[PDB]
Amino acid sequence: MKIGIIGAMEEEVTLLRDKIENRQTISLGGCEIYTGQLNGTEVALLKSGIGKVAAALGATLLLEHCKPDVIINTGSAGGLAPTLKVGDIVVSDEARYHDADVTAFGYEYGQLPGCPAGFKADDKLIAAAEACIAELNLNAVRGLIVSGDAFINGSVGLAKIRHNFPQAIAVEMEATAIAHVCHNFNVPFVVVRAISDVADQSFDEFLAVAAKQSSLMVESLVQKLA
Amino acid sequence: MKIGIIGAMEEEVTLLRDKIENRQTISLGGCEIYTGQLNGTEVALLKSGIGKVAAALGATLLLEHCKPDVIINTGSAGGLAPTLKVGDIVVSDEARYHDADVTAFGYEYGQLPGCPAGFKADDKLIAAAEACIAELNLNAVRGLIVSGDAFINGSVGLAKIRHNFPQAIAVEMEATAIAHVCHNFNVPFVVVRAISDVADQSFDEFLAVAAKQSSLMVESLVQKLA
Numbered sequence: 106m107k108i109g110i111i112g113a114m115e116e117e118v119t120l121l122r123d124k125i126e127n128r129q130t131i132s133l134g135g136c137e138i139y140t141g142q143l144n145g146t147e148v149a150l151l152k153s154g155i156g157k158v159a160a161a162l163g164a165t166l167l168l169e170h171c172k173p174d175v176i177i178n179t180g181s182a183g184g185l186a187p188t189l190k191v192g193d194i195v196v197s198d199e200a201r202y203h204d205a206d207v208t209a210f211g212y213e214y215g216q217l218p219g220c221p222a223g224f225k226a227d228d229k230l231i232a233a234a235e236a237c238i239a240e241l242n243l244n245a246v247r248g249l250i251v252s253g254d255a256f257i258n259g260s261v262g263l264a265k266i267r268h269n270f271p272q273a274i275a276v277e278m279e280a281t282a283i284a285h286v287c288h289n290f291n292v293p294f295v296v297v298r299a300i301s302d303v304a305d306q307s308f309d310e311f312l313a314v315a316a317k318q319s320s321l322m323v324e325s326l327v328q329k330l331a
Numbered sequence: 332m333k334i335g336i337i338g339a340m341e342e343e344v345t346l347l348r349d350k351i352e353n354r355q356t357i358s359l360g361g362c363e364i365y366t367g368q369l370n371g372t373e374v375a376l377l378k379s380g381i382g383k384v385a386a387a388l389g390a391t392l393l394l395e396h397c398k399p400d401v402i403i404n405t406g407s408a409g410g411l412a413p414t415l416k417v418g419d420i421v422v423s424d425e426a427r428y429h430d431a432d433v434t435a436f437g438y439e440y441g442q443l444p445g446c447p448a449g450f451k452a453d454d455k456l457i458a459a460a461e462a463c464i465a466e467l468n469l470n471a472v473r474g475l476i477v478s479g480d481a482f483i484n485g486s487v488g489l490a491k492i493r494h495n496f497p498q499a500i501a502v503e504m505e506a507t508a509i510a511h512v513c514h515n516f517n518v519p520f521v522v523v524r525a526i527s528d529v530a531d532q533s534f535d536e537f538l539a540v541a542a543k544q545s546s547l548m549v550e551s552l553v554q555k556l557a
Protein backbone atom coordinates (compact mmCIF):
# COMPACT_ATOMS: atom_id res chain seq x y z
CA MET A 106 0.00 0.00 0.00
CA LYS A 107 1.20 3.48 -0.97
CA ILE A 108 -0.45 6.49 0.63
CA GLY A 109 -0.48 9.84 -1.12
CA ILE A 110 -0.49 12.83 1.23
CA ILE A 111 -1.34 16.34 0.01
CA GLY A 112 -1.09 18.95 2.74
CA ALA A 113 -1.80 22.66 2.60
CA MET A 114 -0.07 23.48 5.90
CA GLU A 115 3.61 24.01 5.18
CA GLU A 116 4.70 23.15 8.70
CA GLU A 117 2.85 19.84 8.52
CA VAL A 118 4.54 19.00 5.21
CA THR A 119 7.95 19.83 6.69
CA LEU A 120 7.34 17.79 9.83
CA LEU A 121 6.25 14.79 7.75
CA ARG A 122 8.98 15.27 5.13
CA ASP A 123 11.70 15.18 7.80
CA LYS A 124 10.32 11.88 9.10
CA ILE A 125 10.40 10.12 5.73
CA GLU A 126 13.10 7.44 5.44
CA ASN A 127 15.03 6.88 2.21
CA ARG A 128 13.64 10.22 1.05
CA GLN A 129 13.64 10.98 -2.67
CA THR A 130 12.59 14.31 -4.14
CA ILE A 131 10.78 14.43 -7.48
CA SER A 132 10.46 17.80 -9.22
CA LEU A 133 7.73 18.09 -11.88
CA GLY A 134 5.61 20.92 -13.26
CA GLY A 135 7.04 23.24 -10.64
CA CYS A 136 6.07 20.89 -7.80
CA GLU A 137 8.17 18.82 -5.41
CA ILE A 138 7.03 15.35 -4.38
CA TYR A 139 8.76 13.51 -1.54
CA THR A 140 8.71 9.72 -1.58
CA GLY A 141 10.01 7.13 0.82
CA GLN A 142 8.66 5.42 3.90
CA LEU A 143 6.86 6.91 6.89
CA ASN A 144 7.26 4.43 9.74
CA GLY A 145 7.70 1.66 7.18
CA THR A 146 4.79 2.59 4.92
CA GLU A 147 5.41 3.89 1.39
CA VAL A 148 4.21 7.47 0.99
CA ALA A 149 4.25 10.27 -1.57
CA LEU A 150 4.01 13.73 -0.01
CA LEU A 151 3.18 17.02 -1.70
CA LYS A 152 2.51 20.58 -0.57
CA SER A 153 -0.86 21.68 -1.98
CA GLY A 154 -1.08 24.41 -4.62
CA ILE A 155 -3.42 27.41 -4.08
CA GLY A 156 -6.74 27.45 -5.89
CA LYS A 157 -8.52 24.79 -7.94
CA VAL A 158 -6.16 24.59 -10.93
CA ALA A 159 -2.86 24.67 -9.02
CA ALA A 160 -4.18 22.06 -6.60
CA ALA A 161 -5.42 19.95 -9.52
CA LEU A 162 -2.03 20.28 -11.24
CA GLY A 163 -0.10 18.94 -8.26
CA ALA A 164 -2.61 16.18 -7.50
CA THR A 165 -2.55 15.01 -11.13
CA LEU A 166 1.25 14.83 -11.14
CA LEU A 167 1.29 12.90 -7.87
CA LEU A 168 -1.46 10.45 -8.82
CA GLU A 169 0.06 9.74 -12.24
CA HIS A 170 3.71 9.56 -11.25
CA CYS A 171 3.39 7.80 -7.87
CA LYS A 172 0.12 5.96 -8.41
CA PRO A 173 -0.88 5.82 -4.71
CA ASP A 174 -3.69 3.61 -3.42
CA VAL A 175 -5.32 6.39 -1.44
CA ILE A 176 -5.15 10.13 -0.93
CA ILE A 177 -5.26 11.92 2.43
CA ASN A 178 -5.68 15.65 1.84
CA THR A 179 -5.09 17.89 4.87
CA GLY A 180 -5.20 21.64 5.49
CA SER A 181 -7.26 24.31 7.26
CA ALA A 182 -10.70 25.72 6.51
CA GLY A 183 -13.27 28.29 7.54
CA GLY A 184 -16.23 26.89 9.43
CA LEU A 185 -19.79 27.42 8.19
CA ALA A 186 -21.71 25.23 10.66
CA PRO A 187 -22.49 27.49 13.70
CA THR A 188 -21.77 24.69 16.16
CA LEU A 189 -18.11 24.50 15.12
CA LYS A 190 -15.23 25.98 17.08
CA VAL A 191 -11.70 26.89 16.08
CA GLY A 192 -9.57 23.78 16.49
CA ASP A 193 -12.31 21.38 15.44
CA ILE A 194 -11.31 18.96 12.70
CA VAL A 195 -13.83 18.42 9.92
CA VAL A 196 -13.84 15.21 7.93
CA SER A 197 -15.49 15.28 4.53
CA ASP A 198 -18.28 12.87 3.68
CA GLU A 199 -18.32 14.67 0.32
CA ALA A 200 -17.02 17.80 -1.42
CA ARG A 201 -18.78 20.19 -3.82
CA TYR A 202 -17.84 23.33 -5.76
CA HIS A 203 -19.68 26.32 -4.34
CA ASP A 204 -18.76 28.40 -7.38
CA ALA A 205 -19.76 26.07 -10.23
CA ASP A 206 -23.00 26.88 -12.05
CA VAL A 207 -24.29 25.16 -15.16
CA THR A 208 -27.87 25.05 -13.85
CA ALA A 209 -29.01 26.71 -17.09
CA PHE A 210 -28.55 23.25 -18.62
CA GLY A 211 -30.32 21.18 -15.98
CA TYR A 212 -27.32 20.49 -13.76
CA GLU A 213 -27.62 20.71 -9.99
CA TYR A 214 -26.00 23.81 -8.50
CA GLY A 215 -22.27 23.26 -8.02
CA GLN A 216 -22.24 20.29 -10.38
CA LEU A 217 -20.05 20.30 -13.49
CA PRO A 218 -20.88 18.38 -16.70
CA GLY A 219 -19.52 14.85 -16.54
CA CYS A 220 -19.28 14.84 -12.74
CA PRO A 221 -21.52 13.73 -9.89
CA ALA A 222 -23.19 16.58 -7.97
CA GLY A 223 -20.71 16.01 -5.16
CA PHE A 224 -17.50 13.97 -4.82
CA LYS A 225 -17.74 11.30 -2.12
CA ALA A 226 -14.94 10.56 0.32
CA ASP A 227 -14.17 6.88 0.95
CA ASP A 228 -16.12 5.33 3.84
CA LYS A 229 -13.10 3.50 5.23
CA LEU A 230 -10.84 6.55 5.10
CA ILE A 231 -13.52 8.66 6.80
CA ALA A 232 -13.84 6.16 9.64
CA ALA A 233 -10.09 5.76 10.09
CA ALA A 234 -9.57 9.53 10.08
CA GLU A 235 -12.33 10.04 12.66
CA ALA A 236 -10.75 7.36 14.86
CA CYS A 237 -7.26 8.88 14.59
CA ILE A 238 -8.65 12.29 15.50
CA ALA A 239 -10.44 10.99 18.59
CA GLU A 240 -7.30 9.12 19.69
CA LEU A 241 -5.46 12.44 19.74
CA ASN A 242 -8.24 13.77 21.98
CA LEU A 243 -9.41 16.12 19.23
CA ASN A 244 -12.95 16.73 18.00
CA ALA A 245 -13.96 15.40 14.59
CA VAL A 246 -17.08 16.62 12.76
CA ARG A 247 -18.20 14.86 9.57
CA GLY A 248 -19.90 16.68 6.73
CA LEU A 249 -19.99 18.50 3.42
CA ILE A 250 -17.01 20.65 2.50
CA VAL A 251 -17.32 23.13 -0.35
CA SER A 252 -14.56 25.00 -2.15
CA GLY A 253 -14.02 27.65 -4.77
CA ASP A 254 -11.43 30.05 -6.14
CA ALA A 255 -12.34 32.70 -3.61
CA PHE A 256 -11.26 33.62 -0.14
CA ILE A 257 -14.62 34.06 1.61
CA ASN A 258 -14.32 37.18 3.72
CA GLY A 259 -17.65 39.01 3.87
CA SER A 260 -21.29 38.36 4.71
CA VAL A 261 -22.43 38.30 1.08
CA GLY A 262 -20.05 35.50 0.13
CA LEU A 263 -21.09 33.43 3.13
CA ALA A 264 -24.78 34.11 2.53
CA LYS A 265 -24.63 32.81 -1.03
CA ILE A 266 -22.80 29.68 0.09
CA ARG A 267 -25.17 28.93 2.98
CA HIS A 268 -28.16 29.56 0.73
CA ASN A 269 -26.94 27.17 -1.97
CA PHE A 270 -25.50 24.68 0.53
CA PRO A 271 -27.20 25.03 3.93
CA GLN A 272 -25.72 21.65 4.89
CA ALA A 273 -22.09 22.59 4.05
CA ILE A 274 -20.01 22.73 7.24
CA ALA A 275 -16.68 24.16 6.02
CA VAL A 276 -15.24 26.13 3.12
CA GLU A 277 -11.82 26.68 1.57
CA MET A 278 -10.06 26.76 -1.80
CA GLU A 279 -8.63 23.38 -2.75
CA ALA A 280 -10.60 20.45 -1.32
CA THR A 281 -13.07 19.82 -4.15
CA ALA A 282 -10.44 20.16 -6.90
CA ILE A 283 -8.38 17.42 -5.25
CA ALA A 284 -11.47 15.26 -4.71
CA HIS A 285 -12.38 15.83 -8.36
CA VAL A 286 -8.96 14.70 -9.63
CA CYS A 287 -9.03 11.70 -7.27
CA HIS A 288 -12.49 10.89 -8.61
CA ASN A 289 -11.28 11.01 -12.22
CA PHE A 290 -8.34 8.76 -11.29
CA ASN A 291 -10.73 6.50 -9.35
CA VAL A 292 -8.54 6.80 -6.25
CA PRO A 293 -10.25 6.82 -2.81
CA PHE A 294 -9.70 10.01 -0.81
CA VAL A 295 -10.59 11.75 2.40
CA VAL A 296 -10.38 15.48 2.98
CA VAL A 297 -9.57 16.65 6.50
CA ARG A 298 -9.42 20.29 7.60
CA ALA A 299 -8.61 21.98 10.90
CA ILE A 300 -11.04 24.86 11.44
CA SER A 301 -9.07 28.10 11.64
CA ASP A 302 -12.09 30.37 12.06
CA VAL A 303 -15.86 30.22 12.25
CA ALA A 304 -18.08 32.40 10.03
CA ASP A 305 -19.95 34.29 12.76
CA GLN A 306 -17.65 34.14 15.78
CA SER A 307 -4.08 33.86 17.90
CA PHE A 308 -2.48 33.05 14.55
CA ASP A 309 0.41 31.01 15.94
CA GLU A 310 -1.75 29.52 18.66
CA PHE A 311 -3.84 28.02 15.88
CA LEU A 312 -1.40 27.34 13.06
CA ALA A 313 1.47 26.16 15.25
CA VAL A 314 -0.91 23.74 16.96
CA ALA A 315 -3.04 22.67 13.97
CA ALA A 316 -0.07 21.84 11.76
CA LYS A 317 1.65 19.75 14.44
CA GLN A 318 -1.50 17.85 15.38
CA SER A 319 -2.48 17.36 11.75
CA SER A 320 0.95 15.83 11.06
CA LEU A 321 0.55 13.46 14.02
CA MET A 322 -2.95 12.67 12.75
CA VAL A 323 -1.53 11.85 9.29
CA GLU A 324 1.23 9.70 10.79
CA SER A 325 -1.36 7.83 12.86
CA LEU A 326 -3.71 7.47 9.89
CA VAL A 327 -0.91 6.14 7.69
CA GLN A 328 -0.03 3.41 10.20
CA LYS A 329 -3.71 2.58 10.73
CA LEU A 330 -4.40 2.12 7.02
CA ALA A 331 -1.12 0.19 6.83
CA MET B 332 9.77 20.84 -32.49
CA LYS B 333 6.68 19.21 -30.96
CA ILE B 334 3.32 20.96 -30.83
CA GLY B 335 0.71 20.27 -28.18
CA ILE B 336 -2.89 20.77 -29.30
CA ILE B 337 -5.81 20.89 -26.86
CA GLY B 338 -9.21 21.47 -28.42
CA ALA B 339 -12.68 21.77 -26.90
CA MET B 340 -14.77 20.99 -29.98
CA GLU B 341 -15.17 17.24 -30.35
CA GLU B 342 -15.39 17.45 -34.15
CA GLU B 343 -12.12 19.37 -34.46
CA VAL B 344 -10.27 16.75 -32.40
CA THR B 345 -11.70 13.95 -34.54
CA LEU B 346 -10.71 15.70 -37.77
CA LEU B 347 -7.19 16.33 -36.49
CA ARG B 348 -6.89 12.87 -34.92
CA ASP B 349 -7.70 11.29 -38.30
CA LYS B 350 -4.84 13.21 -39.96
CA ILE B 351 -2.09 12.24 -37.51
CA GLU B 352 0.55 9.94 -39.01
CA ASN B 353 1.98 7.01 -37.00
CA ARG B 354 -0.73 7.77 -34.47
CA GLN B 355 -0.35 6.44 -30.94
CA THR B 356 -3.03 6.74 -28.27
CA ILE B 357 -2.12 7.26 -24.62
CA SER B 358 -4.69 6.69 -21.88
CA LEU B 359 -3.96 8.56 -18.64
CA GLY B 360 -6.16 9.69 -15.75
CA GLY B 361 -9.31 9.18 -17.79
CA CYS B 362 -7.94 11.21 -20.70
CA GLU B 363 -6.78 10.20 -24.16
CA ILE B 364 -3.79 11.79 -25.88
CA TYR B 365 -3.01 11.17 -29.54
CA THR B 366 0.61 11.52 -30.65
CA GLY B 367 2.31 11.29 -34.00
CA GLN B 368 2.99 13.61 -36.90
CA LEU B 369 0.65 16.14 -38.50
CA ASN B 370 1.99 16.69 -42.01
CA GLY B 371 5.47 15.73 -40.77
CA THR B 372 5.38 17.70 -37.50
CA GLU B 373 5.39 15.96 -34.11
CA VAL B 374 2.12 16.78 -32.32
CA ALA B 375 0.26 15.73 -29.16
CA LEU B 376 -3.54 16.03 -29.34
CA LEU B 377 -6.07 16.05 -26.51
CA LYS B 378 -9.74 17.03 -26.14
CA SER B 379 -10.26 19.36 -23.19
CA GLY B 380 -12.63 18.47 -20.37
CA ILE B 381 -15.38 20.75 -19.03
CA GLY B 382 -14.39 23.23 -16.32
CA LYS B 383 -11.11 24.46 -14.87
CA VAL B 384 -10.12 21.34 -12.93
CA ALA B 385 -10.93 18.84 -15.69
CA ALA B 386 -9.16 21.03 -18.22
CA ALA B 387 -6.16 21.45 -15.89
CA LEU B 388 -6.00 17.70 -15.31
CA GLY B 389 -5.72 16.87 -19.01
CA ALA B 390 -3.31 19.70 -19.76
CA THR B 391 -1.04 18.63 -16.89
CA LEU B 392 -0.85 15.07 -18.22
CA LEU B 393 -0.04 16.22 -21.75
CA LEU B 394 2.62 18.72 -20.69
CA GLU B 395 4.39 16.22 -18.42
CA HIS B 396 4.11 13.12 -20.56
CA CYS B 397 4.73 14.73 -23.97
CA LYS B 398 6.94 17.73 -23.19
CA PRO B 399 5.64 19.91 -26.06
CA ASP B 400 7.55 23.06 -27.01
CA VAL B 401 4.33 25.02 -27.46
CA ILE B 402 0.61 24.67 -26.78
CA ILE B 403 -2.23 25.57 -29.13
CA ASN B 404 -5.55 25.72 -27.30
CA THR B 405 -8.75 25.93 -29.36
CA GLY B 406 -12.47 25.91 -28.71
CA SER B 407 -15.49 28.21 -28.69
CA ALA B 408 -16.70 30.99 -26.43
CA GLY B 409 -19.42 33.56 -25.87
CA GLY B 410 -18.68 37.04 -27.19
CA LEU B 411 -18.60 39.97 -24.79
CA ALA B 412 -17.54 42.84 -27.07
CA PRO B 413 -20.49 44.56 -28.83
CA THR B 414 -18.60 44.56 -32.13
CA LEU B 415 -18.06 40.79 -32.08
CA LYS B 416 -20.31 38.61 -34.22
CA VAL B 417 -20.90 34.87 -34.32
CA GLY B 418 -18.15 33.33 -36.41
CA ASP B 419 -15.40 35.77 -35.42
CA ILE B 420 -12.27 34.15 -34.02
CA VAL B 421 -10.81 35.59 -30.83
CA VAL B 422 -7.08 35.15 -30.23
CA SER B 423 -6.02 35.69 -26.64
CA ASP B 424 -3.30 38.13 -25.77
CA GLU B 425 -4.06 37.25 -22.15
CA ALA B 426 -6.31 34.96 -20.07
CA ARG B 427 -7.90 35.68 -16.68
CA TYR B 428 -10.25 33.96 -14.23
CA HIS B 429 -13.52 35.88 -13.90
CA ASP B 430 -14.47 33.88 -10.80
CA ALA B 431 -11.33 34.07 -8.62
CA ASP B 432 -11.40 36.51 -5.72
CA VAL B 433 -8.70 37.07 -3.11
CA THR B 434 -8.99 40.85 -3.29
CA ALA B 435 -9.15 40.82 0.51
CA PHE B 436 -5.36 40.42 0.39
CA GLY B 437 -4.45 42.92 -2.31
CA TYR B 438 -4.86 40.62 -5.31
CA GLU B 439 -6.35 42.11 -8.47
CA TYR B 440 -9.79 40.65 -9.08
CA GLY B 441 -9.39 37.33 -10.87
CA GLN B 442 -5.79 36.89 -9.66
CA LEU B 443 -4.87 33.92 -7.48
CA PRO B 444 -1.97 33.59 -5.01
CA GLY B 445 1.17 32.36 -6.74
CA CYS B 446 0.10 33.67 -10.15
CA PRO B 447 0.32 36.88 -12.21
CA ALA B 448 -2.98 38.79 -12.61
CA GLY B 449 -3.36 37.26 -16.05
CA PHE B 450 -1.54 34.72 -18.18
CA LYS B 451 0.07 36.10 -21.33
CA ALA B 452 -0.08 34.15 -24.58
CA ASP B 453 3.16 34.10 -26.55
CA ASP B 454 3.67 37.18 -28.76
CA LYS B 455 5.08 35.11 -31.59
CA LEU B 456 2.35 32.48 -31.35
CA ILE B 457 -0.35 35.16 -31.32
CA ALA B 458 0.93 36.80 -34.51
CA ALA B 459 1.22 33.39 -36.19
CA ALA B 460 -2.34 32.44 -35.26
CA GLU B 461 -3.56 35.78 -36.56
CA ALA B 462 -1.82 35.21 -39.91
CA CYS B 463 -3.31 31.73 -40.28
CA ILE B 464 -6.82 32.97 -39.56
CA ALA B 465 -6.49 35.82 -42.09
CA GLU B 466 -5.15 33.40 -44.70
CA LEU B 467 -8.38 31.42 -44.26
CA ASN B 468 -10.51 34.50 -44.96
CA LEU B 469 -11.83 34.47 -41.39
CA ASN B 470 -11.85 37.32 -38.91
CA ALA B 471 -9.49 37.29 -35.95
CA VAL B 472 -9.96 39.59 -32.97
CA ARG B 473 -7.23 39.92 -30.35
CA GLY B 474 -8.11 40.51 -26.72
CA LEU B 475 -8.67 39.30 -23.17
CA ILE B 476 -10.55 36.02 -22.62
CA VAL B 477 -11.96 35.25 -19.16
CA SER B 478 -12.88 31.80 -17.78
CA GLY B 479 -14.78 30.44 -14.83
CA ASP B 480 -16.72 27.33 -13.78
CA ALA B 481 -20.08 28.73 -14.84
CA PHE B 482 -22.10 29.24 -17.99
CA ILE B 483 -22.89 32.93 -18.39
CA ASN B 484 -26.41 33.53 -19.68
CA GLY B 485 -26.84 37.28 -19.36
CA SER B 486 -28.45 38.67 -16.22
CA VAL B 487 -26.35 39.54 -13.13
CA GLY B 488 -23.59 37.12 -14.07
CA LEU B 489 -22.90 38.99 -17.30
CA ALA B 490 -23.04 42.43 -15.68
CA LYS B 491 -20.60 41.28 -13.01
CA ILE B 492 -18.08 40.15 -15.65
CA ARG B 493 -18.44 43.37 -17.66
CA HIS B 494 -17.93 45.32 -14.45
CA ASN B 495 -14.85 43.43 -13.25
CA PHE B 496 -13.33 42.98 -16.71
CA PRO B 497 -14.28 45.92 -19.01
CA GLN B 498 -11.62 44.79 -21.48
CA ALA B 499 -12.68 41.13 -21.68
CA ILE B 500 -14.02 40.33 -25.13
CA ALA B 501 -14.86 36.63 -24.73
CA VAL B 502 -15.90 34.19 -22.01
CA GLU B 503 -15.87 30.40 -21.65
CA MET B 504 -14.86 27.68 -19.15
CA GLU B 505 -11.34 26.30 -19.83
CA ALA B 506 -9.02 28.87 -21.44
CA THR B 507 -7.49 30.34 -18.28
CA ALA B 508 -7.04 26.96 -16.61
CA ILE B 509 -5.03 25.75 -19.61
CA ALA B 510 -3.05 29.01 -19.81
CA HIS B 511 -2.34 28.66 -16.08
CA VAL B 512 -1.00 25.11 -16.38
CA CYS B 513 1.22 26.10 -19.34
CA HIS B 514 2.48 29.04 -17.29
CA ASN B 515 3.47 26.76 -14.42
CA PHE B 516 5.24 24.42 -16.88
CA ASN B 517 6.86 27.47 -18.53
CA VAL B 518 5.53 26.43 -21.96
CA PRO B 519 4.52 29.02 -24.60
CA PHE B 520 0.83 28.90 -25.52
CA VAL B 521 -1.86 30.60 -27.57
CA VAL B 522 -5.61 30.53 -26.89
CA VAL B 523 -8.04 30.72 -29.81
CA ARG B 524 -11.83 30.66 -29.59
CA ALA B 525 -14.54 30.75 -32.26
CA ILE B 526 -17.46 32.91 -31.09
CA SER B 527 -20.62 30.78 -30.93
CA ASP B 528 -22.92 33.56 -29.71
CA VAL B 529 -22.86 37.17 -28.55
CA ALA B 530 -24.21 38.63 -25.31
CA ASP B 531 -27.65 40.25 -25.54
CA GLN B 532 -28.03 39.15 -29.17
CA SER B 533 -27.98 26.70 -33.05
CA PHE B 534 -24.94 25.64 -31.03
CA ASP B 535 -24.63 22.41 -33.00
CA GLU B 536 -25.11 24.17 -36.33
CA PHE B 537 -22.42 26.68 -35.37
CA LEU B 538 -20.21 23.81 -34.22
CA ALA B 539 -20.56 21.94 -37.53
CA VAL B 540 -19.05 24.97 -39.28
CA ALA B 541 -16.56 26.32 -36.72
CA ALA B 542 -15.04 22.97 -35.74
CA LYS B 543 -13.98 22.32 -39.33
CA GLN B 544 -12.51 25.80 -39.85
CA SER B 545 -10.66 25.55 -36.55
CA SER B 546 -9.09 22.23 -37.57
CA LEU B 547 -7.75 23.74 -40.79
CA MET B 548 -6.52 26.76 -38.83
CA VAL B 549 -4.67 24.42 -36.45
CA GLU B 550 -3.16 22.40 -39.29
CA SER B 551 -2.00 25.62 -40.93
CA LEU B 552 -0.56 26.98 -37.65
CA VAL B 553 1.31 23.72 -37.00
CA GLN B 554 2.99 24.02 -40.40
CA LYS B 555 3.60 27.74 -40.00
CA LEU B 556 5.35 27.04 -36.69
CA ALA B 557 7.35 24.10 -38.06
Ligand SMILES: Nc1ncnc2[nH]cnc12
Nearest residue numbers: 182183255256257277278
Ligand atom coordinates in the same frame (compact mmCIF):
# COMPACT_ATOMS: atom_id res chain seq x y z
N1 LIG C 1 -12.81 31.78 4.74
C1 LIG C 1 -12.13 31.13 3.80
N2 LIG C 1 -12.51 31.18 2.46
C2 LIG C 1 -11.80 30.51 1.52
N3 LIG C 1 -10.69 29.75 1.72
C3 LIG C 1 -10.34 29.73 3.05
N4 LIG C 1 -9.28 29.06 3.58
C4 LIG C 1 -9.31 29.30 4.90
N5 LIG C 1 -10.32 30.09 5.29
C5 LIG C 1 -10.98 30.36 4.11
Ligand SMILES: Nc1ncnc2[nH]cnc12
Nearest residue numbers: 408409481482483503504
Ligand atom coordinates in the same frame (compact mmCIF):
# COMPACT_ATOMS: atom_id res chain seq x y z
N1 LIG D 1 -21.50 32.36 -22.65
C1 LIG D 1 -20.75 31.37 -22.18
N2 LIG D 1 -20.44 31.29 -20.83
C2 LIG D 1 -19.67 30.27 -20.38
N3 LIG D 1 -19.13 29.25 -21.11
C3 LIG D 1 -19.47 29.37 -22.44
N4 LIG D 1 -19.09 28.52 -23.44
C4 LIG D 1 -19.63 29.01 -24.57
N5 LIG D 1 -20.34 30.13 -24.39
C5 LIG D 1 -20.24 30.36 -23.04
